[PDB]
Amino acid sequence: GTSSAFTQIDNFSHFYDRGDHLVNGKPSFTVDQVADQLTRSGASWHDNDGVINLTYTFLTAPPVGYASRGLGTFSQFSALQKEQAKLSLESWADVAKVTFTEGPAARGDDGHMTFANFSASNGGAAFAYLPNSSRKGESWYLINKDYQVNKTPGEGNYGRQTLTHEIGHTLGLSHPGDNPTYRDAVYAEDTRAYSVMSYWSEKNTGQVFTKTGEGAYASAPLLDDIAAVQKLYGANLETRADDTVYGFNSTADRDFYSATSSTDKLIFSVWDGGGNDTLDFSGFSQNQKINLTAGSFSDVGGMTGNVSIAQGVTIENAIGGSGNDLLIGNDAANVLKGGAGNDIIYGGGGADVLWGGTGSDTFVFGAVSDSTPKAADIIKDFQSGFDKIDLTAITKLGGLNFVDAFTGHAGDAIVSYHQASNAGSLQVDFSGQGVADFLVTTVGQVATYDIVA
Numbered sequence: 001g002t003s004s005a006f007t008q009i010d011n012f013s014h015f016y017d018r019g020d021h022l023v024n025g026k027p028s029f030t031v032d033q034v035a036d037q038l039t040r041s042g043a044s045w046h047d048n049d050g051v052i053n054l055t056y057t058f059l060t061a062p063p064v065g066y067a068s069r070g071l072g073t074f075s076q077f078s079a080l081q082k083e084q085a086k087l088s089l090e091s092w093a094d095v096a097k098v099t100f101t102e103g104p105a106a107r108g109d110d111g112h113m114t115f116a117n118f119s120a121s122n123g124g125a126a127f128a129y130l131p132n133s134s135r136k137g138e139s140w141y142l143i144n145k146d147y148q149v150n151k152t153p154g155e156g157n158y159g160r161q162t163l164t165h166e167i168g169h170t171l172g173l174s175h176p177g178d179n180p181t182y183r184d185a186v187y188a189e190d191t192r193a194y195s196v197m198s199y200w201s202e203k204n205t206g207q208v209f210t211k212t213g214e215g216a217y218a219s220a221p222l223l224d225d226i227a228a229v230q231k232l233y234g235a236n237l238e239t240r241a242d243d244t245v246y247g248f249n250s251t252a253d254r255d256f257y258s259a260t261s262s263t264d265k266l267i268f269s270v271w272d273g274g275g276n277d278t279l280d281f282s283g284f285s286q287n288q289k290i291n292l293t294a295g296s297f298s299d300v301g302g303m304t305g306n307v308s309i310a311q312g313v314t315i316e317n318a319i320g321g322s323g324n325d326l327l328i329g330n331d332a333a334n335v336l337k338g339g340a341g342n343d344i345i346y347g348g349g350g351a352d353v354l355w356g357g358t359g360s361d362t363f364v365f366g367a368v369s370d371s372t373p374k375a376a377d378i379i380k381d382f383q384s385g386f387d388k389i390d391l392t393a394i395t396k397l398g399g400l401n402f403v404d405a406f407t408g409h410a411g412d413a414i415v416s417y418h419q420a421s422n423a424g425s426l427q428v429d430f431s432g433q434g435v436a437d438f439l440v441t442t443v444g445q446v447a448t449y450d451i452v453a
């Protein structure tokens with residue numbers, strides 16, 4: 001078998017797997033299947049220029065026929081609502097080839113949107129219309145003494161998500177399914193851990209974002225939402241195409257991607273167009289499980305399944321926090337830093353740069369191809385006696401035979417050290433061809449007792 005360290009890596013790596021199985025008695029849908037699901041109405045703005053350019057207006061007066069909508073008193077968006085609406089619009093624009101410019105309907109635009117408030121509860125908390133309807137572009141928001149949610153929308157609260165969700169609807173995204181409860185969902189992932197369009201909380205799928213008495217809602221399009229809107233209008237590859245840091249020390253310039261304190265409740269799906277990027281969750285003291293696999297979920301900031309990387313996005317680096325984290329790389333050359341605490345770092349393919357940080361860290365390898373002589377991982381701060389290099393997924397605990405030179409037998413391993421440069425290495429001949437087919441180099445000596453095989 002394998003060590004518990006690898007099992008933990010393997011477990012988390014698969015913990016959020018989707019497709020071809022039942023969850024909560026419902027079929028689990030992959031991202032692509034949800035994208036089909038969320039665009040099942042067939043409605044969309046139409047372009048040609050390859051981009052959908054929409055204009056939008058913050059209504060200053062009721063439109064003709066307004067009074068017949070049974071909405072009561074009309075009111076214009078306050079400056080705060082406009083501000084939040086613009087951030088919400090932007091977060092959609094960041095991921096799909098759609099643009100939102102404030103202004104009156106124009107001949108050259110591809111459609112027009114309107115935002116306004118109403119005061120009669122009978123109208124519902126808020127609502128919008130698909131782009132193929134006669135009220136295409138419109139989204140309305142309730143505000144009265146009894147319902148104050150839309151009055152102060154802000155990063156992380158339902159007021160901001162409402163804006164995001166309603167705009168999503170005007171873009172062509174329908175709700176995940178047709179009193180109803182999650183039990184009536186058509187697919188397992190119909191919760192707001194996967195999509196802001198869902199009416200059901202993340203607790204239905206097991207994720208934990210916050211506790212009772214507190215609200216925590218993704219401010220921007222989540223994983224399936226991104227997939228859905230990109231299916232409709234194409235992926236916007238131009239956003240954040242240079243190097244980008246997400247989380248703490250964020251350079252993404254988006255409130256929902258920024259963290260400044262250990263108590264921040266991050267709920268986002270990373271959309272990124274290119275460059276060498278990092279998920280920096282170093283400011284957190286809670287245990288995290290960061291997965292750089294495209295389309296995968298991570299447990300960040302003491303929460304679970306709250307962070308994800310969109311399909312088609314390559315994120316290269318991850319920085320754990322103070323807790324006992326799991327860091328999982330992808331096929332690219334990754335820089336993974338555990339931070340303080342006892343971490344389990346898995347590089348995956350390519351030559352990775354691993355940092356344990358203080359504590360007692362474990363560097364896991366699941367396949368020979370993870371770290372070869374021609375493309376080897378480098379653990380830049382290996383602390384012998386405390387850190388470990390785990391090869392159990394490869395050896396299945398069969399053990400290794402530490403020697404000074406490969407004898408041609410499968411399982412031979414060579415622990416070397418070059419004092420003059422404080423550089424160490426673990427070479428292994430798994431195939432037994434008489435030469436190393438697996439290599440890991442370190443900064444700091446490595447001893448046979450630091451290896452788990």
Ligand SMILES: [Ca+2]
Nearest residue numbers: 240242244275
């Ligand atoms: Ca980037």
Ligand SMILES: [Ca+2]
Nearest residue numbers: 274275277314
């Ligand atoms: Ca990248």
Ligand SMILES: [Ca+2]
Nearest residue numbers: 320321338341
């Ligand atoms: Ca850590």
Ligand SMILES: [Ca+2]
Nearest residue numbers: 338341356359
């Ligand atoms: Ca550490």
Ligand SMILES: [Ca+2]
Nearest residue numbers: 329330347349
């Ligand atoms: Ca990698």
Ligand SMILES: [Ca+2]
Nearest residue numbers: 347348350370
């Ligand atoms: Ca690797």
